[PDB]
Design a protein around this ligand. Structure first.
Ligand SMILES: Nc1nc2[nH]c(I)nc2c(=O)[nH]1
Ligand SMILES: Nc1nc2[nH]c(I)nc2c(=O)[nH]1
Ligand SMILES: Nc1nc2[nH]c(I)nc2c(=O)[nH]1
Ligand SMILES: [Ca+2]
Lengths: 266, 266, 266
């Protein structure tokens, strides 16, 4: 049944998603899932040997290619990473269920670990375009929640200290920040960015927190990595050019992809 | 007509609601109404003589028991209190009309006083779990409103000085606070809690302000009382276990039940 | 097709609107457009010669009178100002598309400059009721966006410095401030007002920013002018009576329409 239909149980569709993915991939269960956001598009190429590719629109609940990858750890053991193909934003109007469907499907496949990445604007002048920042916490400014009902979930540690420790083994220099989510799709005015800051955020973007609350609700351990696309409006006196931003964004691709693939082995 | 349809006038449903109530109870008009939040389930047991109980889902506009209670005052005269059953939340996804329908039903019965109570997280460390707090003002962070048109209504004193005066005669030690309504149902993150602080809140919860605005627009005097369920996330260095919370919550039962009962007689 | 039909292209409907206007008015294109807000009702009477009046409920996508005005310039040339009739608020529940249809219809007629006016409450005590204020930036607190897709648009200078400079050649005494948009229609509680102050706003109201973001997306140069209806709740020690507000409101009429006429010539 259609995820859009309020009578529909969202987890029942995630269930059917998971069961399709297992049949189409020959992988009974996965161990971790990655949501590659703006800028990480090739961040999974060094994850490992692709085991299966599933036309994403073919999976229950969805509507480009979801990948199943054998991650090989140093001791030789293997994990199975589910790389979600698409991504649906809150701004698309498709409902919060559609925004978090990837996450709940990740869950149903048994992937206890979730890696959420995104592109965003930075409020700390110390982190320029290209800088990856670990999420230490978040501020959901969407006035939305992906949970329906008396689902009183606790968010005291949405972003697992365990996982950031493992990220800091791969690169002890990665800074940490509080990520704030705006509904988007438009960008923030300088007065809005000052606001984000006053409220305590170090980063601003238009995704991830709904996904994160959803995942914690499913009992997942969540790693959150932002790739600062460029300083937020009004932060730097000398704003980068749009071409400069896109340029600083491509430059990061190899580093960023090296990062994920390494963290994923642990 | 069903409240869910934009065509329906929510007030006409309220009217049907109050007419059902006067018929079923034999009480032609109530004088005051009480909404019992989390932790107040038994706060109306010393209120007075229960004259009638109406299964809530039987009153037009709803869908668990609504009560008419006689309040015997000092001077020997009576007052009838309507104790609204349910309490539909914004997060239930049934619409803002469903949220404030009880308040409009109460207004329709002729109540001129509304007491709203709720359970919330506290940000003042002085107010441990079990602490009742009068609302001196609120901050509605739901980006939603109960009013549907160029209905420009004044909120300069949503929480009546008169009623807080009376409550202080009953118990001059009730502190007062500014309450913030988040849409929920998830709880706030340590960063969002600090944020509520930064914005000027002393308390965070998932209800009440929509109801209060609805009420003032209907001309009622509002008294808001919160019951700190437990310090908000990240507030206390030392979290209280669930046993401590549920425990501090039950110990407060006798006090708030006596509080309302006294307040109702005035 | 109807605008609230998600499959409908909001821009096709703007186009259809621009075409109706062109034939109904005889003017092939407009150069600028004005949105008359609360208190600006007669602010376009001195603009110039009314070349045509089109009942609004008659232009595609709408549902009082939309005006086509010839503006005579210093060098003798002329410009055409499309003065939008109506004005649909976010609160009416019609959808964000109907809120910014006016703007999109203006752009489609070829207008390049847009003057957004509104009445609002003020947080600065030096700007009492009747004071016109220019917007230097805004804070959109509605959790909504007029944009429906990966439409990533830069909002670093929503309110054109160019125009604000012209605004100041006309009247060098106009102060500037940051505008906060609440979804409304209920007004703000004293704490919500302090909140807006802490967040960086000098003015609070129920419109403008979604339109502005919409204009900026269409490539329009935006000039935003508020008229302080009166001080925000809890700001002034001695609040004005509603009689004093409406009065201060009308006494500003001639200055306000002189202002727009002079600005319209440039
Ligand atoms: N809101 C918001 N979203 C973003 N997404 C990206 I990539 N960069 C930004 C940014 O600066 N602000
Ligand atoms: N938002 C919110 N609602 C609550 N309800 C209760 I009981 N405790 C809380 C809390 O800490 N936050
Ligand atoms: N939100 C808001 N809108 C307004 N519109 C006008 I006229 N005055 C106000 C005000 O004080 N607050
Ligand atoms: Ca597993």
């Amino acid at each position: 049944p259609p995820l859009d239909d309020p009578a529909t149980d969202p987890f029942l569709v995630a269930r059917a998603a998971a069961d399709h993915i297992a049949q189409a991939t020959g992988v009974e269960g996965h161990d971790m899932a990655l949501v590659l956001g703006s800028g990480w598009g090739g961040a999974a190429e060094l994850l490992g040997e692709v085991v299966a590719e599933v036309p994403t629109h073919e999976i229950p609940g969805f509507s480009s290619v979801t990948r199943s990858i054998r991650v090989e750890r140093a001791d030789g053991s293997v994990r199975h990473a589910l790389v979600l193909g698409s991504r649906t934003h809150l701004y698309e109007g498709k409902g919060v269920r559609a925004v978090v469907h990837g996450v709940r499907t990740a869950a149903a496949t048994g992937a206890e670990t979730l890696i959420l990445t995104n592109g965003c604007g930075g409020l700390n002048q110390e982190w320029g375009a290209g800088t990856p920042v670990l999420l230490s916490d978040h501020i959901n400014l969407t006035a939305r929640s992906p949970l329906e009902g008396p689902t009183f979930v606790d968010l005291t540690d949405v972003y697992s200290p365990r996982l950031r420790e493992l990220a800091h083994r791969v690169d002890p220099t990665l800074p940490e920040g509080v990520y704030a989510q705006f509904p988007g799709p438009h960008y923030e005015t300088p007065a809005e960015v000052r606001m984000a800051g006053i409220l305590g955020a170090d980063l601003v973007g238009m995704s991830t927190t709904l996904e994160a609350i959803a995942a914690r609700h499913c009992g997942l351990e969540v790693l959150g990595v932002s790739l600062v696309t460029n300083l937020a409006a009004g932060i730097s006196p000398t704003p980068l050019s749009h071409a400069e931003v896109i340029e600083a964004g491509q430059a990061a691709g190899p580093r960023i992809s090296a990062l994920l693939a390494d963290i994923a082995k642990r």
